[PDB]
Amino acid sequence: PGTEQYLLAKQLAKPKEKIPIIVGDYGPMWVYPTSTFDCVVADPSYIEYQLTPTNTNRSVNHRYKHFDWLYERLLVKFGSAIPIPSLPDKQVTGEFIKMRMERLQAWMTRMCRHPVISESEVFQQFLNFRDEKEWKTGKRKAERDELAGVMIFSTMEPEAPDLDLVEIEQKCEAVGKFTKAMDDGVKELLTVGQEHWKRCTGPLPKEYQKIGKALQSLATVFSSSGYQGETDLNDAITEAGKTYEEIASLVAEQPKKDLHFLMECNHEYKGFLGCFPDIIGTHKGAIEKVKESDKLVATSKITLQDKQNMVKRVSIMSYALQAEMNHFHSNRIYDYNSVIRLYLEQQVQFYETIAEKLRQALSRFPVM
């Protein structure tokens, strides 16, 4: 009964760490700072990743366990208002970090970028703690921060006219519609991409490896005829054989140059998407109860005041839902535009490289 907690609380409580929301050139949005700071992670007694925020140049170390602590806290606090991606995972008991730390740096960056997650006490303390006590004390301030769940909305304050159930309801279904559809759209590119990946690093190269060796085999036999005029052709035929091997290799190592990234971007968004279900659920559920406000007023189970607060608070929720989406779409555009451009360039360079490798081999052949 948390949704009823925020919708019916006493609320004599005024937020300290107020989270602003405004209406930019188009739709409600978060108040983005003007000092965006990222944070490096690397330099691997257990595994202790070193976080180096490019903002104070004061390092801090954390073991994976700590990250889960951070994610969990973030999830519990802003989880019902903002999509909190999922941390990677420890493959086996030991390549590993290469695909792990990689996804960890990303996770950190995303968090860092978010105009709200970053300015959060809990995120700060995680990055800015001086000693064992300072850390332990902070690592307990959060765990006890009752300002979480649906309650997070109360700390938010939008500077715009209050919304109404009609429009509010549209945005919710609107959002749930787009996200669900995307998760499918993304889920598919992933499927296909993973298959193509298997082929490009699997059988495809073998085929070229095969042809390349077959050619050379022929050439060598051709050279065992003692006929006048073999040197020219045989050599050309051989180098060609080798060229295909080079090509096979070039093919096997190609996915990691491009497909990989397209694939990563999608996994990352597949994650964000995997969060909206529970977010919308909360919004829908909230909207429903508000609808039951009138019937609750007539039955005298709540006063007209209680109803006002319910609307005012559910209306706030809408603003946050949109403020976040604006953040979501904003990044989507930039990210997909970048990775796909990147994927395309790399491809071009790839095929161009093969073409030339052939031209050379070609020009090695005689004319008869």
Place this chain on the structure above:
Amino acid sequence: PGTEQYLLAKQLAKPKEKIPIIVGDYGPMWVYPTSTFDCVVADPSYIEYQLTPTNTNRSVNHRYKHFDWLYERLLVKFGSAIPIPSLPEEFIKMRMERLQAWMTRMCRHPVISESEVFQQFLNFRDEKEWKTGKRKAERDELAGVMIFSTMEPEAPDLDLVEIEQKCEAVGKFTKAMDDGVKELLTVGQEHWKRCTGPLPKEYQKIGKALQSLATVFSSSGYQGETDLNDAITEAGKTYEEIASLVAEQPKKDLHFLMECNHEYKGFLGCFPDIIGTHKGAIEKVKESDKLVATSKITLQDKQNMVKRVSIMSYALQAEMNHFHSNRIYDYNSVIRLYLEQQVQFYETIAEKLRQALSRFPVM
């Protein structure tokens, strides 16, 4: 058997059709004519084919079956001396294609092309002439191992030593090439299946995927995507086109490489028997010493076998000279072709991607 029949034949009578062999600067070889011709096979009441020998404009029409008859006859007559390549919408076109090449090989062979059977097959004015030539060829008892009797090498007789090693060599080369061609033919067919099956479907699947996404991206109601989502949908189509390219590519190159290696597989399938024939000959010529001491053959009889098996060798080396020279020209040609088409293929993909890339604004 017929081997002994030839090596120890009576003889004393030179044949009518004579096939000369001379040793030029690069070993023995057939006598190539001054003006080599060719033949045309096209223009399709059962199915037939019109053969127009560029030599002297005057076509004749034959039904595939007639060709089969020709293959047989050729094989029976020059088979133990010369490799006879094998015979074969898609069907009638390939068969017509394969028949053209087949016909050309024959026409460009110094011995075959000038043979009575081959000639008459090309120029018969009516059923009478035809059925006649057909009966004469079928009864041309100058075939098999006897064919060598019609050959006259203009050079010193060879020795059982060189003849042998020369023969072995030929078996070792042909056999190896045969194994080498079979390997190439295998991987080529595999890669063909790939390029025409899965691979294309993958790009196809990716192309669609992109489009589906772009579409969804449009239902965001957000602002600015007009440029982006448009470039995405375009790129997706690009891949869908690329898919088609990949699929229709083999016919443009791989196809030919295969045809070349297929034709030679036939050529190489004929050597087992040819070499077997020669090898068997060398043995009969060996036991001669025994056949003499045992009063089986006269001293003269032996000389005939030696001198005669010398002719065989010359022939072998003459055909080999023919074989190798064309192998070189054929492989170099087809491979260049494969490479050319390959380059065009990849540059085409590169280009189509470059276009899709342009539609994507920077940032």
